[PDB]
Amino acid sequence: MREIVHIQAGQCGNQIGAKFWEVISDEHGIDPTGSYHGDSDLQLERINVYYNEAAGNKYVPRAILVDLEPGTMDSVRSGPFGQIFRPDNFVFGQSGAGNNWAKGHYTEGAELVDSVLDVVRKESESCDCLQGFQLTHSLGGGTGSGMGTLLISKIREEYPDRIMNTFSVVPSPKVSDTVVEPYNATLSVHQLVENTDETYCIDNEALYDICFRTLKLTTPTYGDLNHLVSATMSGVTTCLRFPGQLNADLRKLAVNMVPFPRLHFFMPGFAPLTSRGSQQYRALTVPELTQQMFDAKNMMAACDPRHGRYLTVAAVFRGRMSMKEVDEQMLNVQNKNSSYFVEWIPNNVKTAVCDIPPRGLKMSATFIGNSTAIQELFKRISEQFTAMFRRKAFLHWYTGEGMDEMEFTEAESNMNDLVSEYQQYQD
Amino acid sequence: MRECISIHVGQAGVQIGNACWELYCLEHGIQPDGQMPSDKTIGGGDDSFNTFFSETGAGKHVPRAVFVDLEPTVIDEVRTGTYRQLFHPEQLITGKEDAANNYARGHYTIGKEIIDLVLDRIRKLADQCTGLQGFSVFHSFGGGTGSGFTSLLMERLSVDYGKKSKLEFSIYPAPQVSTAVVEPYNSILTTHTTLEHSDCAFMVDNEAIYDICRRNLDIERPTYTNLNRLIGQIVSSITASLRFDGALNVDLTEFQTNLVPYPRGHFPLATYAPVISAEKAYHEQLSVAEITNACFEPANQMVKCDPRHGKYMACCLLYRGDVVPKDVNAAIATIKTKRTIQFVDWCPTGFKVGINYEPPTVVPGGDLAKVQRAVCMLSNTTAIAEAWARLDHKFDLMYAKRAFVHWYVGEGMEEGEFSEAREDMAALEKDYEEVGVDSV
Ligand SMILES: CC(=O)O[C@@]12CO[C@@H]1C[C@H](O)[C@@]1(C)C(=O)[C@H](O)C3=C(C)[C@@H](OC(=O)[C@H](O)[C@@H](NC(=O)OC(C)(C)C)c4ccccc4)C[C@@](O)([C@@H](OC(=O)c4ccccc4)[C@H]21)C3(C)C
Numbered sequence: 001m002r003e004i005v006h007i008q009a010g011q012c013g014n015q016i017g018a019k020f021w022e023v024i025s026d027e028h029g030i031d032p033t034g035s036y037h038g039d040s041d042l043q044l045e046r047i048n049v050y051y052n053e054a055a056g057n058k059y060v061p062r063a064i065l066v067d068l069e070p071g072t073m074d075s076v077r078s079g080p081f082g083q084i085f086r087p088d089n090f091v092f093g094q095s096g097a098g099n100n101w102a103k104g105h106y107t108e109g110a111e112l113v114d115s116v117l118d119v120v121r122k123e124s125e126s127c128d129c130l131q132g133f134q135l136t137h138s139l140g141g142g143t144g145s146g147m148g149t150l151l152i153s154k155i156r157e158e159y160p161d162r163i164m165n166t167f168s169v170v171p172s173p174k175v176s177d178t179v180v181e182p183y184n185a186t187l188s189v190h191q192l193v194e195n196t197d198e199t200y201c202i203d204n205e206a207l208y209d210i211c212f213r214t215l216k217l218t219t220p221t222y223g224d225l226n227h228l229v230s231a232t233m234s235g236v237t238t239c240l241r242f243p244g245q246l247n248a249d250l251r252k253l254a255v256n257m258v259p260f261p262r263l264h265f266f267m268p269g270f271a272p273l274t275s276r277g278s279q280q281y282r283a284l285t286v287p288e289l290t291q292q293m294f295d296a297k298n299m300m301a302a303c304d305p306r307h308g309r310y311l312t313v314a315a316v317f318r319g320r321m322s323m324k325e326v327d328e329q330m331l332n333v334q335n336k337n338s339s340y341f342v343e344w345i346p347n348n349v350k351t352a353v354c355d356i357p358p359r360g361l362k363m364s365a366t367f368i369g370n371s372t373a374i375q376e377l378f379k380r381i382s383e384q385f386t387a388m389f390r391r392k393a394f395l396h397w398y399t400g401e402g403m404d405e406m407e408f409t410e411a412e413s414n415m416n417d418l419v420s421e422y423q424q425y426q427d
Numbered sequence: 428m429r430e431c432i433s434i435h436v437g438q439a440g441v442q443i444g445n446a447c448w449e450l451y452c453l454e455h456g457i458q459p460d461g462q463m464p465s466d467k468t469i470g471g472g473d474d475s476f477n478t479f480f481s482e483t484g485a486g487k488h489v490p491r492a493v494f495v496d497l498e499p500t501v502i503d504e505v506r507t508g509t510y511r512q513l514f515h516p517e518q519l520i521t522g523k524e525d526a527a528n529n530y531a532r533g534h535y536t537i538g539k540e541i542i543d544l545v546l547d548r549i550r551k552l553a554d555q556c557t558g559l560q561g562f563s564v565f566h567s568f569g570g571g572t573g574s575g576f577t578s579l580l581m582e583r584l585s586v587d588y589g590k591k592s593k594l595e596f597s598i599y600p601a602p603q604v605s606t607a608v609v610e611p612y613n614s615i616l617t618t619h620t621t622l623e624h625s626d627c628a629f630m631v632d633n634e635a636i637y638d639i640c641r642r643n644l645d646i647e648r649p650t651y652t653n654l655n656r657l658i659g660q661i662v663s664s665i666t667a668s669l670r671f672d673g674a675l676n677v678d679l680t681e682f683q684t685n686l687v688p689y690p691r692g693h694f695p696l697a698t699y700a701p702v703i704s705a706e707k708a709y710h711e712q713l714s715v716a717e718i719t720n721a722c723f724e725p726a727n728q729m730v731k732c733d734p735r736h737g738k739y740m741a742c743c744l745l746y747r748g749d750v751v752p753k754d755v756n757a758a759i760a761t762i763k764t765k766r767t768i769q770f771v772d773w774c775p776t777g778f779k780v781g782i783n784y785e786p787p788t789v790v791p792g793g794d795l796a797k798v799q800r801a802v803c804m805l806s807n808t809t810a811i812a813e814a815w816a817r818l819d820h821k822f823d824l825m826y827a828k829r830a831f832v833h834w835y836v837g838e839g840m841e842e843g844e845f846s847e848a849r850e851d852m853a854a855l856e857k858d859y860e861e862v863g864v865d866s867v
């Protein structure tokens with residue numbers, strides 16, 4: 001009624017908040033329903049009663065907001081798209097923001113990580129049955145990286161039933177930090193094993209390929225990258241939520257992409273990438289839309305999935321097209337991709353359709369999946385970790401925050417086997 | 428007088444009804460057409476006093492009726508902006524338990540909690556009137572509300588109402604599909620009907636429908652909103668026909684025995700031979716008795732059940748509208764004249780034929796013809812014997828082989844629900860095969 005919990009953390013999460021959510025007074029945001037049926041309104045609200053429950057649907061913005069260094073305060077709160085809301089906003093009172101997992105996660109966050117409990121409580125209550133826990137977050141965030149794992153852990157701890165949906169940001173061959181090797185590795189052991197159900201990837205090093213291949217943009221931008229993601233979330237969050245002929249509730253999301261317990265991670269795409277001008281090619285196609293949903297080039301992640309096999313593929317299309325058309329087309333993908341399909345597993349591809357195409361695309365395509373490929377996204381941060389942080393060690397910084405050989409060694413070995421165990425499928 | 432009781436089960440089901448309940452739109456109803464002047468939404472028929480659900484009126488004026496939604500989703504439709512059809516209030520269930528895909532979920536979990544209240548609805552519902560001779564279940568082979576919920580809702584209904592054989596519909600996986608869950612999963616949903624109860628069942632093979640739409644009608648582009656009519660219509664033949672005044676009439680208790688050749692729930696196929704295009708020109712009209720053949724054509728065939736394999740078994744054909752007696756006796760003979768039909772070793776003039784009136788109903792362009800001669804093949808052939816194999820290759824590898832249950836356990840029982848459902852639905856494969864593999 002499948003209502004919704006909004007948790008936004010760090011930089012990537014708060015800012016990312018800025019761009020997910022504004023794609024919403026597009027109106028469906030997270031579980032009211034209604035509104036969005038005959039236009040109207042806008043902003044950071046409407047006409048009723050506040051708090052909270054007008055959530056992401058009519059009179060209110062429901063979110064749980066978590067900033068740990070008053071960057072998200074000012075960046076959006078004020079002049080920008082929102083109000084937000086008041087009372088729903090965290091500002092860490094200067095904590096001084098931390099780079100380092102151990103740091104808002106063990107340190108300033110605990111203190112706030114407790115203040116984030118009150119937000120979660122009030123939202124949880126809302127009079128609706130909440131099925132999502134939505135969290136933005138940043139490999140190399142400390143606030144996000146190790147505050148997001150704190151937030152995630154209690155939420156799995158107290159809300160076992162409610163699979164967490166977490167948006168991710170990652171490491172690609174380009175960098176932030178230097179401590180992000182290991183920072184996101186510790187953000188890991190907790191992202192597998194920390195009640196985070198499914199896990200999104202949003203590599204910023206892969207986001208560019210998209211905003212620049214598919215798209216033309218001449219000079220991207222960090223705000224424009226926020227157009228990208230909205231895509232990847234609306235399909236999941238709005239789509240299926242919003243009306244629909246085969247509809248997949250978030251929980252279909254956790255059985256469809258996880259085929260087992262360790263935190264199944266996914267990659268996701270939006271096709272309708274389009275080119276402003278090129279605007280003119282394939283009238284929002286399905287094959288079009290299927291086509292773009294597998295390519296090595298249209299995935300909005302830092303794995304190039306082609307190396308290996310996917311294990312689970314969840315795709316979603318909400319254009320008003322044939323329920324026969326989407327399902328008939330997705331097969332063709334599956335047969336020129338064998339090796340990309342997991343021999344176990346039949347039905348290697350799930351398809352969902354919802355009933356309203358994104359405001360102004362006319363016809364949409366969202367994609368989800370796990371392949372064997374990710375043995376990649378990590379056999380990269382781990383090579384990184386062993387030779388980095390854990391190496392000749394880089395954690396004095398973190399060594400004060402409170403983590404001592406632990407949270408490093410455990411995060412490599414647990415996150416490691418991830419590599420072996422993951423591979424295990426299809427070697 | 429011999430009412431049906433109509434139960435939905437899942438997404439597949441709440442809609443499918445929309446196909447069933449719209450197709451009804453001719454003044455009929457589950458088992459009471461005993462007649463009505465209303466039309467349309469029924470609005471225009473009057474209000475005689477009343478309130479939710481209608482005392483003023485019979486099922487006729489308003490339906491046989493019971494929708495189960497474990498998500499508002501489809502149910503909000505049928506409730507949707509008084510979706511053009513207000514077919515009653517309070518024959519819907521809408522459980523905001525949050526939907527669950529799992530045979531385990533909804534069936535063991537959220538469903539347990541609201542299978543009851545439903546049972547209550549059914550019971551009351553099962554009481555207002557006389558002769559209910561039927562229970563309809565729309566079922567999938569994937570949808571949490573459709574497996575365990577149905578293995579729940581069929582199971583309780585079988586247990587509670589042993590005398591009233593249930594009829595359930597199906598929408599089974601094939602080569603393509605949804606989920607990964609559904610290779611096993613529906614397996615699980617297949618165990619339960621079975622010996623829990625159930626009677627004859629029917630399916631629309633979603634991979635058969637969109638096929639027949641591409642080999643027999645036209646519109647490769649097509650939406651499920653249209654595939655429902657192919658399957659929607661199957662019912663109209665089964666209930667509206669046999670449930671309406673005519674020559675040689677098979678009731679819901681005719682369905683059970685004519686399909687059922689031995690007792691491990693049996694399965695059936697639906698063929699609708701009238702399927703002519705909006706873009707056709709059937710040889711001004713399509714020959715009535717060719718209609719029979721239409722049936723056998725592997726092509727009308729709803730499912731990917733290669734009849735190629737084996738010998739049919741029970742063949743129940745329901746002809747409606749302007750059919751001729753000499754068409755049946757004399758066209759039905761013909762089939763049993765080809766090599767191929769290969770009826771079984773103990774089939775004894777297998778073919779059961781009913782005639783119903785009026786005509787082939789229809790609505791709109793998506794509806795094809797105005798064909799005035801129908802064949803519905805409901806059969807039990809060895810084939811089925813192989814689609815379950817299909818699901819069993821999937822299962823030996825998808826669920827059990829290396830296991831996809833960690834979602835599912837989460838909701839309830841392990842090591843049978845799975846192991847028991849493979850071994851019991853398995854032998855189905857062996858037992859089925861042995862039903863038709865030698866003279867003995
Ligand atoms: C997203 C998208 O389709 O971005 C692009 C850029 O490359 C993408 C391909 C699209 O074909 C293109 C180019 C359009 O031509 C389209 O007609 C259009 C849509 C569908 C708008 O998008 C919407 O109205 C959607 O409803 C979109 N809304 C959306 O992006 O809203 C924001 C408020 C985030 C902007 C959305 C998508 C999916 C789910 C939900 C919503 C966004 C657009 O501005 C435009 O984006 C751009 O020009 C552009 C330039 C730089 C950065 C971003 C966008 C858009 C307009 C109105 C032009």
Ligand SMILES: Nc1nc2c(ncn2[C@@H]2O[C@H](COP(=O)(O)OP(=O)(O)OP(=O)(O)O)[C@@H](O)[C@H]2O)c(=O)[nH]1
Nearest residue numbers: 246247437438439442526527528529570571572605
């Ligand atoms: N032909 C046809 N198939 C349908 C229709 N609705 C659903 N299905 C099929 O039903 C299967 C399951 O549909 P879902 O909507 O996922 O089922 P559900 O009711 O959501 O499943 P749960 O969330 O577990 O309860 C899919 O394979 C669909 O193809 C329909 O109207 N017609």
Ligand SMILES: Nc1nc2c(ncn2[C@@H]2O[C@H](COP(=O)(O)OP(=O)(O)O)[C@@H](O)[C@H]2O)c(=O)[nH]1
Nearest residue numbers: 010011012015016138140141142143144145176
């Ligand atoms: N997509 C996206 N990435 C961002 C944004 N801000 C920062 N990042 C990226 O995420 C990394 C971590 O930044 P931030 O989220 O501020 O980290 P944290 O808050 O310290 O964990 C950086 O190295 C950036 O590459 C943003 O607004 N959007």
